[PDB]
């Protein structure tokens, strides 16, 4: 399966698709969320009635914050990948002022919203989601891709109750070591904080942080300021709630491992050390990939184009200049 997946990825990686739609083909309905250089909006393809999520980026803001390379990485990778637990890019284009990425709309909202509301997920609920991430990372790492931004905020729940990973802003194709200080404070591996060279093992540490937060209701390392969070991460010490099972505590000690020669996912057997662990004994790995396992939660469906599972944001008029901005910089987009 992985050998055939690589052939498909490399063909698109070498010759990326460009300019597959235009802004005037879509009706802008409402803002679903915001980011550093723009926003995500619910749109409708007027001639079909199909709904989508459109990510809009201001070219001038990207250049100002020196994020050109990361923005090009995000689009090049997303147009080349194909997996059930990854959000699909339908169209991409640009104009004088902005960059546009049109993705499949996920109406169930972010895992973040549901997790904070109910407090914490049960161990079988946490297991179902964790299994989907394990398979997604197995797929991504095999293509020499590093994700670098795992958190409940980036995990969308579809109408089948399955996960769809979004935001490839820090995704990169790398063989060997990389050095960029990027990610979310609570999810940073100690090797990132200590300005060392790092590899794919940072995604396996992030999985440890995610499983802990899902089962406890709070992260393993928290404070009011990022500097205090970093102090707790580098110390090595982790305390587990009394309700955590014996098998869950053992897996987390192996994922939240400071020593790279001992961290699960980074050993001789690779991903198999995680997949064969006692906590995953009941997991049917093939049935998860095939979407045959019953989901613990199915989000309430209120028709097409409904935004009830998302928070409200202040609207703003999208401006397109009569003069081309940053033409050479984004030539390959």
């Amino acid at each position: 399966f992985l050998a055939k997946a690589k052939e498909d990825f490399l063909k698109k990686w070498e010759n990326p698709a460009q300019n597959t739609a235009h802004l005037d083909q879509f009706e802008r309905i409402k803002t679903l969320g915001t980011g550093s250089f723009g926003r995500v909006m619910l749109v409708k393809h007027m001639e079909t009635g199909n709904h989508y999520a459109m990510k809009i980026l201001d070219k001038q803001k990207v250049v100002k914050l020196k994020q050109i390379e990361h923005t090009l990485n995000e689009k090049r990778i997303l147009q080349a990948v194909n997996f059930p637990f990854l959000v699909k890019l339908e169209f991409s284009f640009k104009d004088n002022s902005n960059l546009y990425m049109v993705m499949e709309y996920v109406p169930g909202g972010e895992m973040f919203s549901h997790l904070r509301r109910i407090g914490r997920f049960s161990e079988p609920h946490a297991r179902f989601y964790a299994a989907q991430i394990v398979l997604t990372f197995e797929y991504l790492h095999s293509l020499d891709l590093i994700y670098r931004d795992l958190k409940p905020e980036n995990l969308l729940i579809d109408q089948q109750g399955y996960i769809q990973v979004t935001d490839f802003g820090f995704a990169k194709r790398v063989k060997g070591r990389t050095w960029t200080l990027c990610g979310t404070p609570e999810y940073l591996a100690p090797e990132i904080i200590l300005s060392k060279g790092y590899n794919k093992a940072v995604d396996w540490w992030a999985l440890g942080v995610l499983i802990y937060e899902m089962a406890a209701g709070y992260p393993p390392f928290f404070a009011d300021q990022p500097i205090q969070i970093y102090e707790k991460i580098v110390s090595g010490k982790v305390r587990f709630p009394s309700h955590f099972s014996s098998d869950l505590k053992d897996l987390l000690r192996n994922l939240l491992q400071v020593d790279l020669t001992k961290r699960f996912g980074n050993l001789k057997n690779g991903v198999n050390d995680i997949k064969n662990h006692k906590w995953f004994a009941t997991t049917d790995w093939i049935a998860i990939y095939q979407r045959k396992v019953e989901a613990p939660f199915i989000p309430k469906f209120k028709g097409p184009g409904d935004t009830s599972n998302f928070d409200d944001y202040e609207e703003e008029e999208i401006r397109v200049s009569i003069n081309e901005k940053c033409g050479k910089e984004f030539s390959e987009f």
Binding site: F112, E153, Y218
Partner: peptide
């Protein structure tokens, strides 16, 4: 409790990238 300390902290909302 650790839960009470988390809910009283300033980082319970959506977390942005560094």
């Amino acid at each position: 409790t650790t839960y009470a300390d988390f809910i009283a902290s300033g980082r319970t909302g959506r977390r942005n990238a560094i």
